[model samples]
Target: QIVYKPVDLSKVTSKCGSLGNIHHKPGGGQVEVKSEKLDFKDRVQSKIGSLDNITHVPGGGNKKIETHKLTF
Candidate 1:
């Protein structure tokens, strides 16, 4: 003689599965999105470098075509 009872969800972290329910580590598997500004400075530096190479000329384009690849 066995009876099945419905489990209540109130104040429960989650459903109990084969792995169990109380398995949690705050920072065990932390992940971040690109929306973060972690590398904002490096990104800005590279962006500025590209802008400088394209917008400003270090010297006269004596070899205009030659510098194109260099700028690129």
Candidate 2:
């Protein structure tokens, strides 16, 4: 569970333009927004700030995997 604390949004805004693009669970003053609301395309657009032409890799076809990391 995320421990609550009073935090300024500006501090977060300074680091990130929008929290919606963040994938990690935020703590402090932030709350978890709907995952679906996250605009991954926009995130990538800002970060790569960028994709390759390669259509295939040595691995299987876009095989999906999911997991939650044990936070330290």
Candidate 3:
């Protein structure tokens, strides 16, 4: 038997908010306006940085295999 307790949204404070709008949450805080959201490339770069070192290898379709053939 397993019992799983789920967290309620009412108790959790939102980390994100709408742009140029008042911060609305359960807790009380100063009205510090949130910063503008990043673009697709900016967000990706911020989280994943660069990937120049990684090398990709192709699948086995073009590879040559050596084998011994038995003839009658």
Candidate 4:
């Protein structure tokens, strides 16, 4: 089995107006923006700041398992 765990999207409030956006979920989930009204990619370029650490599992196709401990 393969598992892809996403990190919590943080620092959302700081990117609101710049990205023509609003808060969707409070914390630790996907960023739901007004996609039909605004193009977030045009205004803001998303970047992953830092990851806690990554663990590699040998059997599962050399899968890179990223483990993040989010603080919000």
Evaluated with lDDT, which candidate comes out highest? 4
- lDDT tens digits by residue: candidate 2, 1-72: 786455444321223333333243433353343443445654364432112223322322334444554466
Which portions of model 4 miss their true places by more than 4 Å?
1-39, 42-45, 60-72
Tell me the spans in candidate 3 whose CA falls farther than 4 Å from its real position.
Answer: 1-35, 39-48, 59-72
Error of 3 at 25 (Å): 50
lDDT of each: 0.35, 0.38, 0.41, 0.43
lDDT of 1 by residue, 1-72 (tens): 545445554432333334423443343343343543545544364332121212333322333221222221
- In lDDT terms, how accurate is model 3? 0.41
Error of 2 at 61 (Å): 2.6
Query: Compared with the true structure, what per-residue lDDT tens digits does model 3 show for residues 11-63?
Result: 32334333343453444344334456655744364433332333343332244
Tally clashes: model 3. 0
**TM-score for all predictions?**
0.13, 0.14, 0.13, 0.19
Comparison by lDDT, 2 against 4, better one: 4
Q: Considering lDDT, where higher is better, how would the candidates rank from best to worst?
A: 4, 3, 2, 1
- For model 2, the stretches where C-alpha displacement exceeds 4 angstroms are 1-52, 57-59, 69-72
User: Candidate 1 clashing pairs?
Assistant: none
lDDT of 3 at 35: 56
